[PDB]
Design a protein around this ligand. Structure first.
Ligand SMILES: O=P(O)(O)O[C@H]1[C@@H](OP(=O)(O)O)[C@@H](OP(=O)(O)O)[C@@H](OP(=O)(O)O)[C@@H](OP(=O)(O)O)[C@H]1OP(=O)(O)O
Lengths: 216, 13, 369, 141, 50, 111, 152
């Protein structure tokens, strides 16, 4: 069934602009000659995304000389920049290079962000400690949609309603959730049988792992 | 000087 | 012996895998197709003697090619020195296990062929010949020094002895008692042929070769140095290599100390390469520190340097984690909720009031004690 | 890397041994790729400038310079050789042979003490010196 | 700083005079008896007090 | 009314084994006298703390005899690289005032 | 000049060149009387070896290629990992190389919310503590002055 409740609620349409790349270990003349091969150009691989996988920037390693904490801080719009349309994130499989440009074409009623924390390095798995600075009451995605696409959706203002947060080391980690209780305005943190009343301001401080936003 | 040894090491490894 | 024969039978029947599809290439057909080989019909004893002679000649050629004239090989394939060996000569005489294994194989062939020629001369009876073959195939380890050069061969030897225990105690029933007259050499001959099947490719590869014609950080540092100095102007790299090495060491030290590292005059490509190198070395450093701590805590044998280094690494890692924990406390605020804290405070004040506890005053200036 | 100076022929070696009169000449016979040589050369670079006053270190490739293989019994993957005023100094490490280290110690202080003892014994006049440690047992527990 | 080249000059050429104050600072006349002594025969204090 | 069977916790046994290992590794060039003094102090602390539990715990007794054999071994190897078959125990257990190491014993040693 | 020109006397057999199996590496007949007949013999024997390897050549080579491809994909050599930065490092002017020095030399503040919550908890604890009457406290300055006066 092409249209289920899961697809009707969470699935959206996104336009993948896959641009193949020549091998970097080639002369510049051959590099530009491969631009006429009609293989290393943007393609139309537009598909459906059930969730958005946001990739955090790597940890700053050395702490900044400023008085700020060693914990890195990145705004929500900065990680939500691979889907702006012009940003070109490198994709390199075995003996091949790409430039996967992403452009959203249909915004689902409930948007799912899957922030990438745990990455497998050469020896173990490291959890990215970057803190995402996101608002919890107004996010406008109109700038991430094509002009012919922006006209279709009247509403693009998203409110965060769910926030799954992972705490601790990658192995002995724990999962908690911040849920927005409608009817009221209270925000509640649930961890197993523990239900606490969290303040709306403190949600952005924790390491957001998964996020559910409502389009209104 | 250092590069001469680096090339020998890379070739042999 | 029965139990071990059953053990090896079961092991063969269980470790057995179906044979894999081939293209059916036959070695001897290819040999006949070339000009270097010719076919004839010969007695088995004659070809046994000829093979023994050819093996002796080929071993002589291999010995003399190394100019090791101080080692003499007899016709029974027993290699012995003729003089006290110099250390240089002793190292030159290290032929490896392959040469000795081939020599002992040729010695076993010499034994079998010599027993057969002894029977053919008429000195011994055919029963004596069969019994001698049984003894040879049951006492390869004693008659021939094979086990030292290939340890696995020892297993085969036990097989043969087990097979002897299987045959003798059935052969020696009734009127026949213990004696040297039992000739039944199918089992040991089978076992040694099956060993030869396995070891033929190894000796062929050795002869073809002989007749032809932990420290991840150091390697990481060397490789990044090679990569940087390749992309380096020739006329400037005299001292810039040392400067960038000093920069690499400083960056590693700065990461080890949780202090900012930002060289102003360093170009951003070299800076990014240094950052990547520090990241990789730090990942390896953390992983090897954790692995060494697990090894030491488990009880593995370690020297002082390892423990000292591990302690240092762990110290750095634990202070990194403690700084992270302090910053997390500062960011996420107090972990105790306000109402939780006031509940604890009310509990404490109720306890102390119930105890009628008088608070301890500031150390009095005229304190008697 | 290997910032320590290298000798590319026997001539470089045999005037390097005679170049130093008040400093102990240290020669590492081996191969850079050899890991054990890598450990020793890292240790030497860690102390290359610490012993600049009374010692000097040179790296010699066995393949590049194979003339000393027979005379110095250079059959190990790596050896360390100590000279002073054209005379070799034997060190009694307790390993059986006193002519060459033949192993890579991770602690740089052990090598510093070894070279200091060699210098003290060479300036005093003894051709054979005693290591201030026993290396027969690895001291691992 | 590089480690200075080890050397063994003459330990002392003359004595008396200031030399004595030198030792007085470090190496002054201690008890020099019954402190570095072991008393081969008997035991002081407890057996294995250490 | 009840019997309270005592034992030494495996954590304490591991601490004692680690202390013995530290004594063995931190020996290096130190005099045998100080090594034996450290072993004696460790043994005295263990026994004066776990008096009855040491007797009750068989695994602990095996651990102590193994560690004692290690300490003596260390001294022996220091004396000579070759293994001294039937080494005399008199050198170990003789009190320091009489020239020996003054080593305490917890295993069954037959002179 | 040989090694004896130093006037020294001794007081590939290297362990590296020796392997317990196959003995010492290196063919004993690397050089010798090589002519057209020797080349023909070597070609014939190499052809025989290739024919023998033809038994499982296709599947063996396929498995070898797959295994090496997966090994390289899973674990990349450090030179492969740093090749990207090495090539991105080429774009640098020679003037900047001389400029390399030595080692001789919106956004939300995370501290403010923590300080605010800490101050709130402190205020609550002080409000609760005001009900406690038995607490004792001395005047720091006053006590000190007395200490001052007490100095003989
Ligand atoms: O010469 P060994 O390798 O020690 O073998 C002998 C021998 O067997 P061989 O004839 O194969 O040499 C005897 O055999 P008999 O001549 O007496 O038949 C006898 O074997 P039995 O007494 O079992 O017949 C003996 O045994 P033991 O060592 O128990 O005296 C042992 O044979 P095993 O090595 O098979 O035991």
């Amino acid at each position: 069934k092409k249209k289920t409740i899961v697809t009707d609620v969470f699935q959206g349409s996104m336009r993948i602009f896959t641009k193949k790349l020549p091998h970097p270990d080639l002369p510049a003349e051959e590099k530009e000659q491969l631009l006429h091969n009609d293989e290393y150009q943007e393609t139309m691989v537009e598909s459906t995304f059930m969730y958005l996988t946001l990739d955090l920037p790597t940890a700053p390693l050395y702490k900044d000389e400023k008085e700020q904490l060693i914990i890195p801080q990145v705004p929500l719009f900065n990680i939500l920049a691979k889907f702006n349309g012009i940003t070109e994130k490198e994709y390199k499989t075995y003996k091949e290079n790409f430039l996967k440009r992403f452009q959203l074409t249909k915004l689902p009623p409930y948007l799912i962000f899957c922030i990438k924390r745990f990455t497998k390095n050469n020896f173990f798995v490291e959890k990215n400690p970057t803190i995402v600075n996101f608002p919890i009451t107004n996010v406008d995605l109109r700038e991430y949609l094509s002009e012919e696409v922006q006209a279709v959706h009247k509403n693009t203002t998203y409110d965060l309603i769910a926030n799954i947060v992972h705490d601790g080391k990658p192995s002995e980690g724990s999962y908690r959730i911040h849920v927005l209780h409608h009817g009221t305005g209270k925000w509640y943190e649930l961890q197993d049988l523990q239900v606490t009343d969290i303040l709306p301001q403190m949600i952005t401080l924790s390491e957001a792992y998964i996020q559910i936003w409502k389009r209104r | 000087d250092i590069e001469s040894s680096l090339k020998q090491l890379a070739e042999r490894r | 012996s029965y139990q071990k024969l059953l053990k090896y039978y079961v092991l063969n029947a269980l470790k057995h895998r179906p044979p894999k599809a081939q293209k059916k290439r036959y070695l001897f057909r290819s040999f006949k197709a070339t000009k270097f080989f010719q076919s004839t019909k010969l007695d088995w004893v004659e070809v046994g003697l000829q093979v023994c002679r050819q093996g002796y000649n080929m071993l002589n050629l291999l010995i003399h090619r190394k100019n090791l004239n101080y080692l003499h090989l007899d016709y029974n394939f027993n290699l012995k020195p003729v003089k006290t060996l110099t250390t240089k000569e002793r190292k030159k005489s290290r032929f490896g296990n392959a040469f000795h294994l081939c020599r002992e194989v040729l010695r076993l062939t010499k034994l079998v062929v010599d027993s057969h020629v002894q029977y053919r001369l008429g000195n011994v009876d055919a029963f004596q010949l069969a019994d001698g073959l049984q003894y040879i195939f049951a006492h390869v380890g004693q008659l021939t020094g094979m086990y030292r050069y290939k340890y696995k061969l020892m297993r085969q030897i036990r097989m043969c002895k087990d097979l002897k225990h299987l045959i003798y105690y059935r052969f020696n029933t009734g009127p026949v008692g213990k004696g040297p007259g039992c000739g039944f050499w199918a089992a040991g001959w089978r076992v040694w042929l099956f060993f030869m099947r396995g070891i033929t490719p190894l000796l062929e590869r050795w002869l073809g070769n002989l007749l032809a014609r932990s420290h991840f950080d150091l390697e990481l540092r060397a490789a990044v140095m090679h990569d940087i100095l390749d992309m380096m102007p020739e006329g400037i790299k005299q001292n810039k290599a040392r400067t960038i090495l000093q920069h690499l060491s400083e960056a590693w030290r700065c990461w080890k100390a949780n202090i900012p590292w930002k060289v102003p005059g360093l170009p951003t490509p070299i800076e990014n390469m240094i950052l990547r190198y520090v990241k990789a070395k730090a990942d390896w450093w953390t992983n090897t520190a954790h692995y060494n701590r697990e090894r030491i805590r488990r009880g593995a044998t370690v020297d002082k340097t390892v423990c000292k280094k591990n302690l240092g690494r762990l110290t750095r890692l634990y202070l990194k984690a403690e700084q992270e924990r302090q910053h997390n406390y500062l960011k996420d605020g107090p972990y105790i909720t306000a109402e939780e804290a006031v509940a604890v405070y009310t509990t404490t004040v109720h306890w102390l009031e119930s105890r009628r506890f008088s608070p301890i005053p500031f150390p009095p200036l005229s304190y008697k004690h | 890397s290997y910032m320590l100076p290298h000798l590319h022929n026997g001539w470089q070696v045999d005037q390097a041994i005679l170049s130093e009169e008040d400093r102990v000449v240290v020669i590492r016979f081996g191969h850079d790729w050899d890991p054990t040589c890598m450990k020793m050369d890292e240790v030497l670079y860690s102390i290359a400038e610490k012993v600049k006053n009374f010692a000097v270190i040179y790296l010699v490739d066995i393949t590049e310079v194979p003339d000393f293989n027979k005379m110095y019994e250079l059959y190990d993957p790596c050896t360390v050789m100590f000279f002073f005023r054209n005379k070799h100094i034997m060190i009694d490490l307790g390993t059986g042979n006193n002519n060459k280290i033949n192993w890579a110690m991770e602690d740089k202080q052990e090598m510093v003490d070894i070279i200091e003892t060699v210098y003290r014994g060479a300036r005093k006049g003894r051709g054979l010196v005693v290591s201030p440690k026993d290396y027969s047992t690895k001291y691992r527990y | 700083k590089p480690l200075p080249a080890p050397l063994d000059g003459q330990r002392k050429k003359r004595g008396g005079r200031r030399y004595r104050k030198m030792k007085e600072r470090l190496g002054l006349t201690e008890i020099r008896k019954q402190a570095n002594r072991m008393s081969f025969g008997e035991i002081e204090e407890d057996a294995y007090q250490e | 009314t009840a019997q309270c069977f005592l034992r030494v916790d495996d954590e304490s046994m591991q601490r004692f084994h680690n202390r013995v290992r530290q004594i063995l590794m931190a020996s290096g060039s130190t005099t045998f006298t100080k090594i034996v003094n450290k072993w004696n102090t460790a043994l005295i602390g263990l026994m004066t703390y776990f008096r009855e539990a040491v007797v009750n715990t068989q695994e602990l007794l095996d651990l102590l005899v193994k560690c004692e054999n290690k300490i003596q071994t260390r001294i022996k190897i220091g004396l000579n690289s070759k293994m001294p078959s039937r080494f005399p125990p008199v050198v170990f257990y003789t009190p320091k005032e009489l020239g020996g190491l003054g080593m305490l014993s917890m295993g069954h040693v037959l002179i | 000049v040989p090694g004896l020109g130093r006037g020294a006397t001794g007081f590939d057999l290297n362990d590296t060149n020796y392997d317990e199996f196959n003995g010492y590496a290196g063919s004993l007949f690397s050089s010798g009387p090589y002519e057209k007949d020797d080349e023909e013999a070597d070609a014939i024997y190499a052809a025989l070896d290739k024919r023998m390897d033809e038994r499982r050549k296709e599947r063996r080579e396929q498995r070898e290629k797959e295994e090496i491809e997966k090994y390289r994909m899973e674990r990349p050599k450090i030179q492969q990992q740093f090749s990207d930065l090495k090539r991105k490092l080429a774009e640098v002017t020679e003037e900047e190389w001389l400029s390399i020095p030595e080692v001789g030399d919106g956004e939300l503040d995370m501290r403010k919310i923590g300080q605010a919550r800490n101050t709130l908890m402190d205020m609550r604890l002080s409000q609760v503590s005001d009900s406690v009457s038995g607490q004792t406290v001395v005047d720091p300055k006053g006590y000190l002055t007395d200490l001052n006066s007490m100095i003989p």
